[PDB]
Design a binder for this molecule. Structure first.
Ligand code: A1A63
Ligand code: CL
Length: 167
């Protein structure tokens, strides 16, 4: 039993809700919140910009030190950093950005990072400003993640389409 509330159950381990991941994280304070990161951990917009804003830019300051030490992430890769005031940890995961010409096949690799954590609050990877089809992202999530994932879909209209079209 966990403290996630109001989610629709899609499979044994995947759940979904129309919610703002920032507000969800503040309420639940989950062990792991997933950020929709880029390889430079530059949290400018989308989920990343919103999560960073909620940390009063502390996520960005920590991220800049991470990059200065380690260099950029790989597309499909991840790193674990602090969750600041939002969660214990933030798993920064880089899905492919179609608006940069990146290989959508890397979306499965991106979701594989979730399997290193027993329970996660997460957005749909490569959705939103990353330009991939969210119906596809949800399908890859369900077919790749085996740990317990609670998906927050910010847009109410898109949420209804994902549910009604879910196979
Ligand atoms: O795939 C993740 C994207 C999808 O939403 C954007 C969108 C706009 C119009 C139509 C479809 C989709 N972003 C988020 N998801 C959850 N919580 C969030 N908080 C702030 C951003 C954000
Ligand atoms: Cl977005």
């Amino acid at each position: 039993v966990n403290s996630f509330s109001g989610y629709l159950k899609l499979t044994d381990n995947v759940y979904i809700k129309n919610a703002d991941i920032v507000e969800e994280a503040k309420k639940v304070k989950p062990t792991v919140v997933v950020n929709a990161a880029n390889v430079y951990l530059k949290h400018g917009g989308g989920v990343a910009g919103a999560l960073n804003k909620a940390t009063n830019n502390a996520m960005q300051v920590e991220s800049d030190d991470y990059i200065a030490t380690n260099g950029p992430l790989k597309v499909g890769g991840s790193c674990v950093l602090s969750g600041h005031n939002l969660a214990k940890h933030c798993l920064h995961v880089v899905g492919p950005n179609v608006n940069k010409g990146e290989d959508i096949q890397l979306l499965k690799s991106a979701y594989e990072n979730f399997n290193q954590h027993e329970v996660l609050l997460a957005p749909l990877l490569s959705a939103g400003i990353f330009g991939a089809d969210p119906i596809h992202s949800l399908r890859v999530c369900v077919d790749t993640v085996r740990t317990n994932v609670y998906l927050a879909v910010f847009d109410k209209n898109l949420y209804d389409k994902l549910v009604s079209s879910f196979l």
